[PDB]
Every structure is written in C-alpha cells, then in structure tokens.
Amino acid sequence: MPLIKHPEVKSAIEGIKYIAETMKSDQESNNAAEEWKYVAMVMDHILLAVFMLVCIIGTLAVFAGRLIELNQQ
C-alpha cells in the first residue's frame, strides 16, 4: 500500500472544476480504504499461519503422550 463570458459558460467551467475535485477526493478516500484493506489482509495471513500451527499442535499434543507410551509399552 474573444471574450465570450456568459452565465452558461461559467457554469460549465466551474462544474468541470467541481468534477475534477470530486474524483480527487474520491481517490483520496479510496486510498485510505485500501490501507485498512491491506491491514486486514496482513492479519489474515498471520492468523492463517497461526491457526494451521495450532491445528498441528493440537493434533499432536493431545495424542502424543499415549501414542509414545503405547510404542514403548
């Protein structure tokens, strides 16, 4: 992560400026949204690794002692 100033031309010019500033603010807000999205993706990756590790650890440690004891006796 010539001078043709007229009440309808000025509206068009001002509205074109408004359109540009509108998509400027939209781009800024969108980028601020992708920042949080990147954050959520990073926690997704970290917790994927953590949860697979805990799944392996729970599949092992619950059954480890009684399996090695049966291997020995």
């Binding site: 010539p2 043709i4 309808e8 031309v9 509206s11 068009a12 509205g15 074109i16 408004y18 359109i19 509108t22």
Partner: peptide, 28 residues
C-alpha cells in the same frame, strides 16, 4: 459573430451542464 460559434458550442455547453448536474445528483 459570436452566434455561429454559439450555434456549435451550445450543444457542448448544454451537455457539460447536464454531466455536471448528473454528478451533483449522484453525489447527493
């Protein structure tokens, strides 16, 4: 003069005003 130019620029000005109003309504 200033109306031969306005004979061809009037659709452009009207369309620009329409697009601006459409953006304004969508933002509201």
């Amino acid at each position: 003069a200033q109306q031969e130019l306005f004979s061809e620029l009037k659709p452009a000005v009207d369309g620009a005003n329409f697009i601006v109003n459409h953006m304004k309504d969508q933002n509201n």
